[PDB]
Amino acid sequence: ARIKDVAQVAGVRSNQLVGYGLVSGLPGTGEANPFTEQSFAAMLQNFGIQMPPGTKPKIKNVAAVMVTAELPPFSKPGQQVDVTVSSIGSAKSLRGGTLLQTFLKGLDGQVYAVAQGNLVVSNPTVGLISSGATVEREIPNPFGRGDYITFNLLESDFTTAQRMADAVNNFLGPQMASAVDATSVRVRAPRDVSQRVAFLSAIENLEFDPADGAAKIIVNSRTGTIVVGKHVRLKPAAVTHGGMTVAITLDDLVRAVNQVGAAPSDLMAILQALKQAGAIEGQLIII
């Protein structure tokens, strides 16, 4: 696995932008909500049409939506990012709509992008635009600062952190990378920003073997799927479910489930009994 596949550079982050806007050009599948009409009236005032107070627009092709964009790291003004458009009123469908000018604000309350474009919906009330938002401002980055760069593991593990440190040391030389915890690995990097990009290009393509990790059993209590990871061991026991008795991975337990009618989701309750009896060498996680 390449380092870039299983890790991210510290300080090189994404940012989330959110804004309110109106979607027009709907085939009569718009809203009549008070906030939609209020926003529509304000927008019309912005163009020189001001209705008398208390006038009902009777609009049916306009829907109020919430626009969200994720700003990739090193985003420069003039670039385009995707936006997700979701209806917040009572519009039946956003299919075929057009997002009007909406300003996308950061967590500090400043506008960083402007979103327009045509919605592509499949849920008819959520659509996407491939280049809806144009980046208008930059977010500063700590990437070029300091005397080292840091890799953050996507899956935290002490062994994976140490193996990535060894991979860099073998490639470059001794005392070059060090694991500071189960997630972060610090690599000494050049001070020049151009040399650091060239340096990081060679390092992020290094190959190493991530560790297997702790043995876990993942149970989706609402879907019924049971994922048993590697290194999970079930201690032998006599399991009596329904009217039949079986002796002890899931293959034997699934057969015991199939013996009686019961249900494939009855296996989720057999594991909990095994966990209580100490017959599982691992972690039973319910998601």
Partner: protein
């Protein structure tokens, strides 16, 4: 600015070109400049040659400065002045002795050995040539292993050999068999050896015809052995001189044993 010849981390590669018990050759291609070759050879003494081989030959003899420059990705570390060499005209740069081992050591620490000099082909301007340490460790381990598995004798040490026979029998002594095994190892690993001269001859104890018969039987046994190593029959030469041409005083027990001997002389095509 200046011309710096170094392999970027994406370009740096080290290779073990010759890996035999007679030679070791670790090669680092310096892009746009040439090669850096470390060579060790089977010998009784510690030997390493470093050759900076250039595509465009050295224009003039120049004083060269060897420094141990830290790589860019090592801020806060200073450069160590290693030494001052001389690169000669129309010859590859050569560093030998302890300095070549020191270059290997500075590469082991993760540093860049840098040769700086004024290039004749470059309007007599100062240029730098650096050896990258990227992808050096594994090939340095392989190089150290091959150096470990080097013969402890050279062609000069075995080219002339004199072996002795036992008092009774057609077999060589223990030490003579050990030396013959050394010769066989060197021959089997060296393809440049062309000629083998064998001159068996014995003591005066037996009759002249008997001496000649013993000497010729011994010569033929040695010729068959040398054939077993893979040399073609047109290369081996064997002659039995019997009890003639004594090198020691026949009559003394030690002298007769001295004369009961074979001469083996190798000849190479380097």
């Amino acid at each position: 600015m200046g011309k710096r010849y170094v392999a970027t981390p994406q370009q740096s590669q080290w290779e073990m070109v010759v890996n035999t018990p007679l030679e070791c050759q670790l090669v680092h291609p310096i892009p746009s400049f040439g090669d850096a070759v470390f060579s060790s050879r089977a010998n009784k003494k510690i030997n390493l040659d470093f050759e900076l081989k250039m595509r465009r030959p050295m224009g003039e003899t120049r004083n060269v400065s060897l420094i141990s420059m830290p790589p860019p990705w090592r801020p806060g570390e200073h450069a160590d002045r290693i030494t001052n060499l001389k690169f000669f005209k129309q010859f590859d740069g050569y560093v030998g002795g302890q300095t070549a081992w020191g270059i290997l050591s500075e590469l082991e620490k993760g540093r860049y050995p840098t040769f700086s000099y004024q290039d004749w082909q470059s309007r007599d301007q100062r240029i730098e040539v650096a050896l990258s340490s990227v992808l050096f460790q594994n090939k340095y381990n392989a190089f150290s292993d091959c150096i470990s598995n080097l013969l402890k004798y050279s062609f000069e040490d075995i080219a002339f050999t004199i072996l002795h026979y036992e008092r009774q029998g057609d077999q060589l002594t223990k030490a003579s068999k050990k030396r013959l095994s050394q010769i066989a190892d060197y021959i089997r690993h060296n393809q440049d050896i062309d000629l083998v001269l064998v001159a068996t001859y014995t003591d005066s104890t037996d009759g002249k015809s008997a001496s000649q018969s013993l000497s010729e039987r011994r010569a033929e046994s040695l010729r068959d052995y040398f054939q077993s190593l893979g040399l073609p029959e047109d290369r081996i030469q064997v002659q039995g001189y019997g009890k003639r041409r004594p090198i020691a005083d026949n009559g003394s027990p030690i002298g007769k044993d001295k004369n009961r001997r074979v001469v083996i002389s190798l000849g190479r095509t380097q």
